[PDB]
Amino acid sequence: MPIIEQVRAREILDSRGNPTVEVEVALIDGTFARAAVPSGASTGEHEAVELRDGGDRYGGKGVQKAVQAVLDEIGPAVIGLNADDQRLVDQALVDLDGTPDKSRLGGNAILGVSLAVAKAAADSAELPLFRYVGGPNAHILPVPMMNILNGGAHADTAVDIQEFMVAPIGAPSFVEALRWGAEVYHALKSVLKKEGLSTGLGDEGGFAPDVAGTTAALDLISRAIESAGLRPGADVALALDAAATEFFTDGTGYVFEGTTRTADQMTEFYAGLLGAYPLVSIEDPLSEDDWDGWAALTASIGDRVQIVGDDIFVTNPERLEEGIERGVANALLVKVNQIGTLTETLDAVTLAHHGGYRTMISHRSGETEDTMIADLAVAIGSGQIKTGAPARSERVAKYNQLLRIEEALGDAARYAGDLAFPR
Amino acid sequence: MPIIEQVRAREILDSRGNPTVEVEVALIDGTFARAAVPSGASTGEHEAVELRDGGDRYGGKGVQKAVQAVLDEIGPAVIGLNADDQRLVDQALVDLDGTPDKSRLGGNAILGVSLAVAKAAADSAELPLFRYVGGPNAHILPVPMMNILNGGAHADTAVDIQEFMVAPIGAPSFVEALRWGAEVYHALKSVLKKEGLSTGLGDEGGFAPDVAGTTAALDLISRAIESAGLRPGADVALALDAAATEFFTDGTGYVFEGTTRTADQMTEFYAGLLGAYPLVSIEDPLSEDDWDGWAALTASIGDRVQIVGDDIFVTNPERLEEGIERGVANALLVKVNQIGTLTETLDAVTLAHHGGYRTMISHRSGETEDTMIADLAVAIGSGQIKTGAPARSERVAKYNQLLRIEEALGDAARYAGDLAFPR
Amino acid sequence: MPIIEQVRAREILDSRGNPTVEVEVALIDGTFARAAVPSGASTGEHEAVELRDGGDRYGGKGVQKAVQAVLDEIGPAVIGLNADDQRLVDQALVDLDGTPDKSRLGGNAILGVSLAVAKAAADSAELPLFRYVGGPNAHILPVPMMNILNGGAHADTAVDIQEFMVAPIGAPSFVEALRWGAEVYHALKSVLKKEGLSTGLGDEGGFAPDVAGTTAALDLISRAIESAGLRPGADVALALDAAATEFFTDGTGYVFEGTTRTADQMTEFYAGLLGAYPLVSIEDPLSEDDWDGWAALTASIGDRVQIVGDDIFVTNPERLEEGIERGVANALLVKVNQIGTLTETLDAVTLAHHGGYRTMISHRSGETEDTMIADLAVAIGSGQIKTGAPARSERVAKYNQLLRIEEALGDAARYAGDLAFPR
Amino acid sequence: MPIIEQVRAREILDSRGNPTVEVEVALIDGTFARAAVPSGASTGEHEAVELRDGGDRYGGKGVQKAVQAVLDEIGPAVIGLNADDQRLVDQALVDLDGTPDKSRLGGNAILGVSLAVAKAAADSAELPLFRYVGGPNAHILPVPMMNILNGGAHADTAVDIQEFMVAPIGAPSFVEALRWGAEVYHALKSVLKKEGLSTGLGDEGGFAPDVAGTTAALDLISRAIESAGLRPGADVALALDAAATEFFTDGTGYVFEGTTRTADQMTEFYAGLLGAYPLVSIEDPLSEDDWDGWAALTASIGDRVQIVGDDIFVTNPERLEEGIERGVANALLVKVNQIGTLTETLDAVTLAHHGGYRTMISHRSGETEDTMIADLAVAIGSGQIKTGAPARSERVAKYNQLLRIEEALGDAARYAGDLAFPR
Ligand SMILES: O=C(O)[C@@H](CO)OP(=O)(O)O
Ligand SMILES: O=C(O)[C@@H](CO)OP(=O)(O)O
Ligand SMILES: O=C(O)[C@@H](CO)OP(=O)(O)O
Ligand SMILES: O=C(O)[C@@H](CO)OP(=O)(O)O
Ligand SMILES: [Mg+2]
Ligand SMILES: [Mg+2]
Ligand SMILES: [Mg+2]
Ligand SMILES: [Mg+2]
């Protein structure tokens, strides 16, 4: 019986050395499972609340309140539930909290429990996590969207764009795709060295040189792709995370590469890049509440490129539904800790998929050794994952787990390849 | 270990007294599971091949060849595979057969095995079938599309339209929805008696009166809805299965209610009905290869009503993809035995869902006591199922299994209600 | 230990879309079993009470009272009993109810429990149900008495006789017998089509044409038998269920084919049919309390044909004993829900068998996907079963279960054949 | 899995010190069971063959041939069969032997195996033997027909009648019935002492005085009944086993109480006794092949008394069927070792019960400590058992086992009482 018997939590550190929540769930059948919670830097205003202790300890970033919420409220509320009833458990967590934003117990407390319960349920059913969540049909290895040059909120440089990504769409397999990503990454290191630019890493393992702007970064990456003996576009395409909320002034506009710009001028800039570069995807080109901006931008270039809502949707079925109704974006970034339960995450994924939107499972910039999102990408057959440069094991551990899933699937595996980006 | 140890098959009878295939799978861990195969009357030209014995026995409709294919080829080919590797098993079946149409072993032999393996895998994982196939998030109880007045290939009357369906979209729950369907069905019996019309049943448990045509049938059903104290549209909407391939002459047109008509004239007829009746769905309004007809029809009325491809798509990812590319239909009828594996079925469902098409899990007109499709509707969260009148237990057994699933989900259950048909 | 741990019930639908009772029993050893209750249309006055809710819901036919009786009284009364002590459990049910007719808890509540306990006991002993109930000697596959033309209370026609049955007595095996029944059924469809008569089905899956009377129906069936290449009598004999209580006026006589007739005139009619047709069995030729009628009828023709008490005996040892003492009938129709426990059913079967009466296990006209009666026919070695046309899976599922039993018995199986009807 | 793994046999002694067969069966699940074979003195000509060694050893009565047949032929022929498939095992035994009379392996070899397999099957199903053989409905405790004054082939006296029996039909329970039998037995000892007659026991534990004839014996027994404070007839009735084949001369007649008599004169004698004594049953009043004698006798007195075929039927469905067809007897003596399998025994019981004949489970005059027939009487609900005086533990061990069965049934037990003998 996968009946929940114990729920414990502790404070651990994330990939940036900030505290975060880890939860352990034990079932009466002796199943034991552990899940850890990530933490963003460029956090949307509408994200589920991350409960922090404040005061002096860890610069105010302790999570002993979220840990005590798990031990003293959540544990007692879910012991005796069936770990297999994910939705019942998730509803109990949401009702226990009783706020819209999970501001009482914390999204970080609640998600830890949601995720450890799923894992315990999968363990108890003796199914790999991808197969428990995704069923027997879960088989698609995602294109790894690899952020190999970091800026914005992920480094201490003047680069406005947060993430410069390569996408090995042309690879025959995930195992080859990963190798292509690693070879381009190592080539970019050599390119940056030759140019006298920093190979110091940002938060997501990408090089964090202080380059002059967007096109300089994209030129350096295209050189790195060629220098690894791959063709930009056909083998390795480009993608961005502008995280434009980070450079947007409320009711004002976008302070971008030395000027304040309108949504339409930003759209002009992005349309220029499409013309000049093999870009398959642009995430948060405009700010989280710039609904008119996004609608025009999606009208203008959405037929030509994937447009990914992150801070605009925060993995929230209510915000996604508003986007679908308004013709805003054509893809959803899927972050479990933007919404705070697996159930709500899977409702948002269901709403995207049924609305003809693509899905891209995402890390946060503050990650752990947890590889859950590797299993989650295969489960939902997104065919797209965003989990870092092939550097720093909070990123690599997810790619290593995709290797193991691909290996376990055998002839059943399919690499999403260029079928991830029809445009 | 859910390793397949034995695969046996036998000849059973379907709901019309014709032979069909039943398969039993036993796993080394003592798991034992049984699945039966349905059989259509209005079968699309492009359906996976149903292997029949021919000769005198059962009027040529024996399935002893399909049974011997299971015992002598398939069993030996899949014993020692993991029942959890649904895709590997399904690929082995497809490679063993080695034809495009499953014409060597039979779609009926292959599907029996595909379905019994899924069931054994679910049993071994100690998960209800809906949850094994659908994962922990499977929770949506479908609107029952109930075919309560049967014509075309399902009765011996002059009625051209195959299926006249009621859809209790306004019900708060599946258990109430089912009751509304049953109350309307019993009301329609009384209406038909008062009118001196036959209450003899057709193949799908609907009354098979010889009514004058389409609008007469729809008037009789609207009276039955009112007479059960429900509002046509808001509580109980209408749906059709024209099965127009059955009255279509190759390269000629549609012999419909006493005249040969063009695709555009049929479109005119359907548009008229929309004007006059609370119709939410029309299946196969035009023939299986009338690609231009369907494109125009979907252009003309697809914003206003669900348009369901059955014989045009035959649950076939290659035919569905062609439809999506051409703007043909906005929904897929999902029949496991049109394509012959669970894997291929789930690929077609994935392709529809990712293309923004709706999905409706379907019975065949020749059914068994098997309730697999009840679990399959909840698993894929179609929110729509088509499994007969609430009469004849080959139909009712599926509705009884949806009751049990709803009960097992508890507060987690959601009834798809009017959220099944946004138009 | 097959100790009863839980007893739950729910409302499901029968083959006519009316509510009925389903019961689940769980034993401390993890055994879990489910049984559903049938419901008659032509119900004898002396049948155990079927508890109905009344009011608006399901036209007054809800069974939420019977479900609550299971959950709130019966469950608490039998938890901790051994499921193997069938008689103790059945006595507890009968004492808990405390009425002669089971009018307090309902025959439908009580039987659900009686049947689910037997099934749980059989599961726990790891014996097929036929072998648990019948012991190791249970091996006789019954002649399927197949009601392929429905009238009386089972259709909306002017045909007085309820059931027109074919009996493949000449078949070498149950599997061949079933095929003969199906081939005759499909032949009768073609015969009816040629004659311009309805192939709309009645409640038991038989064609429900409005034929002129008894001999017309029997002529149509004899043609169907010949047209399937079988000999009427030697291969396929005929049988009837007059259900004469349905056309009997208290203290008056029998309104039959356009005239009021005496018991003796009805006897004359039946004796005529014997002369003209290969009839092996006639059920309820006279009304449920017409004791003198039956005695004379059994005197007159009982040496020449099987005479089956249904409404006269209602599977009731007290009514059967009265019949045996008076020389009334020579066979008992065995309906579990006429009496309301398995124990009482088996007492009536024991009383018939010890009195030299034959036994015929029967469905009701309102059936479920439950196949218990298939196992019950083999268990008691009746050699006769009445479970419908080989159409509608509430009938076919029983024939499919007889196939599986025959297969499991191997060389041990015997088909009752013509040894079912010595006269 | 109740798969037969080992079959061993040994030579033991019966209640007379003659060798007989004991068989042990072990199943792969660790089930182990033992059964022993009885041996008659007044053996019918048509009995299954009892294999004896001949020569000097045990006066020619060794069974080392039957033991070696078990070890060397039967064991190898049934290892790997399911012990639950009683009929398959019994058919394998009968086919292995391959003779009509079981003259190759011996009825004693074959029955030992048949009986040990049933017991192992019951043990493996964790069901008491009565319940495994009889199903959940087995509940009737038989009237003990107690042979308390022995003559004919069971003692060395001039008394022609083999068995003088008392039947406590008036007792409320088996436990009281047994006490009544024991009290009458002890009273008869005192009566015989007062009369100067022998209290030396015969083979079946009855006193074996050399009394003048039939009426003297019956007078002595009626005195013993009164002297125990019971009423002859209403409390304790009388029964006989004439075993008339023992005093019949082929084609000649019956040498009985000092004269040769015809069947009709014997019938006259028996009719006289009915007039004078509370007799409920007479077994083998005439010889095993005197078919005309029996038919007349059954015509003459069969309405007034139970008439039991023993040597005429030898538990043989073919001989019983001949009797039923000729109106010979109205009851079958059931001796497993007259026919040599449990299956054939149960076919004969089925044939009697379906023919309206009563059934009386019987010991042989050479018994063992085996109590199988106690369980067999309850299983088949005969309501009559014949297993000796309540003296000599080869008889008492069966009565002790009926006590335990009655105790285990609790409120479910019914004592057959006077409902055993309707006449
Ligand atoms: O990308 C960003 O705008 C922020 C918010 O989505 O998150 P992270 O620091 O995890 O990238
Ligand atoms: O609906 C129809 O055209 C046919 C083909 O899809 O099938 P069935 O007889 O099962 O309805
Ligand atoms: O046959 C009939 O008279 C009735 C009563 O026995 O029952 P049913 O509707 O189940 O046939
Ligand atoms: O009663 C008898 O005639 C013989 C034969 O049936 O047997 P037993 O010695 O066992 O009584
Ligand atoms: Mg972002
Ligand atoms: Mg269709
Ligand atoms: Mg009847
Ligand atoms: Mg005898």
Residue numbers in the entry:
A (entry chain A), B (entry chain A), C (entry chain A), D (entry chain A): 1 to 423
The authors write:
Enolase, a ubiquitous enzyme, catalyzes the reversible conversion of 2-phospho­glycerate (2PG) to phospho­enolpyruvate (PEP) in the glycolytic pathway of organisms of all three domains of life. Here we present structural snapshots of Mycobacterium tuberculosis (Mtb) enolase in apo, PEP-bound and two 2PG-bound forms as it catalyzes the conversion of PEP to 2PG. MtEno has a topology similar to other enolase structures, a smaller N-terminal domain and a larger C-terminal domain. The crystal and the cryoEM structures (enzyme in solution, frozen) along with the biochemical studies clearly demonstrate that the functional unit of MtEno is an octamer.
Of the two structures of MtEno-2PG, one harbored the widely reported 2PG-canonical pose whereas the other revealed 2PG in a novel binding pose [which we refer to as the alternate conformation (2PG-alternate)] in a manner that makes the otherwise unfavorable dissociation of the product from the active site thermodynamically feasible. Notably, 2PG in this alternate conformation has fewer hydrogen-bonding interactions in the active site due to the absence of catalytic MgB 2+. Additionally, NZ of Lys386, which interacts with O2 of 2PG only in the 2PG-canonical pose does not form any interaction in alternate-2PG. We speculate that, by switching to this alternate conformation, 2PG facilitates its dissociation from the active site by weakening the loop 1 interaction (Ser42) with 2PG on its formation from PEP. However, the MtEno–2PG-alternate exhibits a positive binding free energy of 5.5 kcal mol−1, making it thermodynamically unfavorable for the 2PG-alternate to remain bound to the active site. The higher fluctuation in the loop 1 region is largely due to the absence of MgB in the active site, and we hypothesize that the change in 2PG from the canonical to the alternate conformation deforms the MgB coordination, facilitating its release from the active site pocket. Although the crystal structures of both the MtEno–2PG exhibited closed loops, 2PG-alternate had a significantly lower number of interactions at the active site. Taken together, our study suggests that 2PG-canonical switches to 2PG-alternate in order to dissociate and exit from the active site during reverse catalysis.
